[PDB]
Amino acid sequence: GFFVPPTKGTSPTQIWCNNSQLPVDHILAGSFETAMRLLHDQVGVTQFGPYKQLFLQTYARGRTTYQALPCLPSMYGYPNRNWKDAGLKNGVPAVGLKLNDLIQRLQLCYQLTTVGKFEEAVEKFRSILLSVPLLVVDNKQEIAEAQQLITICREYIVGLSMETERKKLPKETLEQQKRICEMAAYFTHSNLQPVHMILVLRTALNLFFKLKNFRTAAAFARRLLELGPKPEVAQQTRKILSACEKNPTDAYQLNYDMHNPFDICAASYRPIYRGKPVEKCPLSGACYSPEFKGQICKVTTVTEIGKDVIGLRISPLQFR
């Protein structure tokens, strides 16, 4: 016999796929269809268009390269994160994106918000949100931070998106104005950080003051002061608040309850109280009124609103 053509062994990238349930690991292996399926089932990704750059970019860092014999096609290397104990069967791809990287980029988002560039802020924010399911976290608390990081992103995305619309609506009708005040007050309930929470409270205060809805304005004034704004703002706020006390009454009844638990409709920008029916993005936690079930989330831009899912998977720990 002597010469027998040898049969292919299993490729390193295939090994990675057979070894992980983590999306990024499959993207790193070039297994897009497999990666997309994982993202579709764990979280509810359905519109993968805005995930193109993440995939290609992630994929481009998957394998190193080096030459063997001159003139022949070069060799590819497949660095493993567990290179020490990875046999020729237990390898899993090196990690090229970490939680800290995402948390760090959050600051540019915070900056952009403060200086009023809401549109760019939403991009950076969305960019981080979509990147969380591409992590490979180590411990259980690191998994909580990832979930909390996603939460921050949607909170600001629907909050800022709502605001940019309110600024677009017309301000002629009394109705048109009651609508603006309402939206402005809804922002008041977003969980941003103090420096921003203050900026939106400051805004709502003015709107409600002009709408001669002084009783509700006084409450906004008190919540703002407790946040400890800069001196000038605090002073202005005390001034408006004493004005409001001369006539502690709201002219018009608005569709807003400051004491009844909300959930902003990320599409219509209207309140969905305590136990009312709501449809939520399986990934961002974004909320929508039942009408929108089955539609592509406006916050995530790639997710399906009604979709039932396994849940975010970014750590082997999550597979007991």
Binding site: G9, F32, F48, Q57, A60, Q67, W83, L88
Partner: protein
């Protein structure tokens, strides 16, 4: 061996050095003179100077040179490829020479590119040189059969434990083995660069070994040095892309390296693959997308 330097310079990747020495060498045997010309043109081929080989190697040239020229046209003319493989198939079956190792190496090379590992391997199986063994090792590795590769290695390990060809082969196998073997590979690449010279080939070998283990910062330097010698060197740019992302560089950086690659080699296999990935992604978007 009077052509020891010439060949060695070739294998470690410093082609100009190979070409320079090839010319300083004096025949001293119609055999050696042919062996020399063979490496001279193998070197021009490595530098992608196809025209030089196609024009200078004429019909009356030795059969060893003809083999080289065969690979040269396959490499140069994309259209002439199937016609070449066809003739190669015929020559390979309708005849039985094996003493001509250069022919086997060139023929096996064409088969390698034609993505026909079985034929390349079947051809090499007939050869008997140390290079035939190194090429067999390379192919076995690309076939992901480290086991078959280890066997061939020892085969050449028993024959010449210190030949740079055996040392390079061992490094490839080590890189494939992973784990501890990674440092072995690093040292042979480093020693080689130290003794001979730091060729783009050897520099990237070192970088691959460092990155295998998670030493991204230590790979920085070798990649910088390689890039400084040739912007547009495929392996360097690719490794830079990978390295940039691990060092946390601005995403534009990774992208710049990618674009730089397209500039230097419009049709490199890595560029083609990238394009292919873009394609099935668009295709897959359509598959999941709402109607």
């Amino acid at each position: 061996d009077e052509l020891f330097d010439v060949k060695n310079a070739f294998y470690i990747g410093s082609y100009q050095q190979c070409i320079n020495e090839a010319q300083r060498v004096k025949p001293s045997s119609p055999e050696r003179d042919v062996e020399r010309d063979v490496f001279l043109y193998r070197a021009y081929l490595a530098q992608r100077k196809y025209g030089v080989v196609l024009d200078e190697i004429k019909p009356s040239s030795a059969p060893e040179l003809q083999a080289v020229r065969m690979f040269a046209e396959y490499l140069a003319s994309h259209s002439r490829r199937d016609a070449i493989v066809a003739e190669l198939d015929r020559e390979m079956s309708r005849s039985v020479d094996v003493t001509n190792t250069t022919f086997l190496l060139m023929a096996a090379s064409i088969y390698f590119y034609d993505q026909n590992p079985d034929a390349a391997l079947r051809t090499l199986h007939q050869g008997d040189s140390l290079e035939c063994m190194a090429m067999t090792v390379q192919i076995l590795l690309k076939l992901d059969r480290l086991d078959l590769a280890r066997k061939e290695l020892k085969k050449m390990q028993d024959q010449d434990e210190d030949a740079t060809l055996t040392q390079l082969a061992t490094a490839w196998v080590s890189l494939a083995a992973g784990g501890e073997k990674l440092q072995d590979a690093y040292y042979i690449f480093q020693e080689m660069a130290d003794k001979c010279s730091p060729t783009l080939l050897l520099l990237n070998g070192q970088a691959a070994c460092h990155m295998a283990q998670g030493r991204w910062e230590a790979a920085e330097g070798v990649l910088q040095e390689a890039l400084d010698k040739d912007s547009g060197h495929p392996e360097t740019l690719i490794n830079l892309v990978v390295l940039s992302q691990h060092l946390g560089k601005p995403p534009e950086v990774t992208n710049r390296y990618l674009s730089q690659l397209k500039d230097a080699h419009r049709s490199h296999p890595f560029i083609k693959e990238y394009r292919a990935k873009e394609n099935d992604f668009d295709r897959l978007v359509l598959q999941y997308a709402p109607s």
